[PDB]
């Protein structure tokens, strides 16, 4: 019943964990505690098998541990800066090749899976710093340029007409802009990892750069040159919605160094490169 299911949603009790049943002393030739990890399987022994347990009714739920929940939180993926220093025409617009590889926080979460499929919610937080005192009337234009569409080379480029591309215009003082993007891949899922090349020569590119081209985000201050200079920083936040993920993997253990690659750097003292805190010895807790 969709209404009972509804109540479970409100209470967050869709996925309940099992109870612990009462167990008793045993003397048997069946030894559940013994197994063989060589098989590649995890021994499914439970507490009732090793100790005498009491009956306990569980009230914990796994709803919050769902993939939708784990990846369904909006995190920063880019900080766009438009700093008017000495040339308005050159400094009032910019572009960014879109990716989820530049901020470690969300990158690491998505990379705990090999493939992922989801729709995207993008929320933008623009902040106008009054470097000279006044901000005037700031109007921004954020244009999504799919691969192949002409990229504007000036603040008055004809490409800004946005005759076909999607553009979002924001006016200072109005609420933060937000829009959704359908799953954009030409494949059935996004590659979080890709052990492949775009060719078969020594100069072929390796990794997700080959498969993950999502276009460019071009920004521009629509307002013409003003007396007072401003520094507009637009932070882009991304949230995955309607998510599916496949083939889990070990979490990134070292710092990221570059986009689209698993490359890392190691110091002479490797213990400083990982989160593992050195133990004094085996018996010192």
């Amino acid at each position: 019943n969709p209404v009972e299911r509804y109540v479970d949603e409100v209470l967050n009790e869709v996925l309940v964990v099992p109870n612990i049943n009462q167990s008793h002393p045993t003397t048997s030739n069946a030894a559940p505690v013994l197994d063989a990890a060589e098989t590649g399987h995890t021994n499914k022994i439970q507490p009732e098998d090793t100790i005498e347990t009491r009956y306990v009714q569980s009230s914990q739920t796994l709803d919050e541990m769902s993939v939708e929940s784990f990846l369904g939180r909006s995190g920063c993926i880019h900080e766009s800066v438009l700093d008017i220093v000495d040339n308005y025409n050159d400094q009032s617009f910019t572009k960014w090749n879109i990716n989820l590889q530049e901020m470690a926080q969300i990158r690491r979460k998505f990379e705990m899976f090999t493939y992922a499929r989801f729709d995207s919610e993008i929320t933008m937080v623009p902040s106008v710093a009054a470097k000279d005192g006044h901000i005037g009337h700031i109007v921004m234009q954020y244009m999504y340029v799919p691969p192949g569409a002409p990229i504007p080379t000036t603040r008055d480029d004809y490409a800004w007409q946005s005759g076909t591309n999607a553009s979002v215009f924001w006016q200072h003082g109005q609420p933060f802009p937000r829009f959704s993007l359908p799953f954009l891949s030409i494949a059935s899922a996004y590659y979080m990892f890709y052990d492949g090349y775009d060719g078969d020569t020594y100069k072929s590119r390796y990794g997700t750069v080959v498969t993950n081209d999502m276009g460019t985000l071009c920004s521009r201050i629509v307002t013409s040159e003003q007396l007072h200079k401003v520094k507009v920083v637009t932070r882009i936040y991304h949230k995955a919605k309607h998510t599916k993920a496949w083939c889990p993997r070990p979490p990134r253990a070292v710092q990221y160094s570059h986009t689209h690659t698993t490359n890392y750097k190691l110091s002479s003292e490797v213990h400083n490169d990982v989160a593992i805190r050195p133990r004094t010895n085996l018996t010192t807790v």
């Binding site: 969709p2 209404v3 509804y6 949603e9 729709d119 959704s180 359908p182 919605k241 309607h242 998510t243």
Partner: peptide, 29 residues
Amino acid sequence: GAQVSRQSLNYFNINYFKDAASSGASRLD
């Protein structure tokens, strides 16, 4: 777009836009 249930405790699962990408977080299971 409205999924109206009844139990009375009526549920209205409204979808305000015409594209699936627009809806909120997915149900579970």
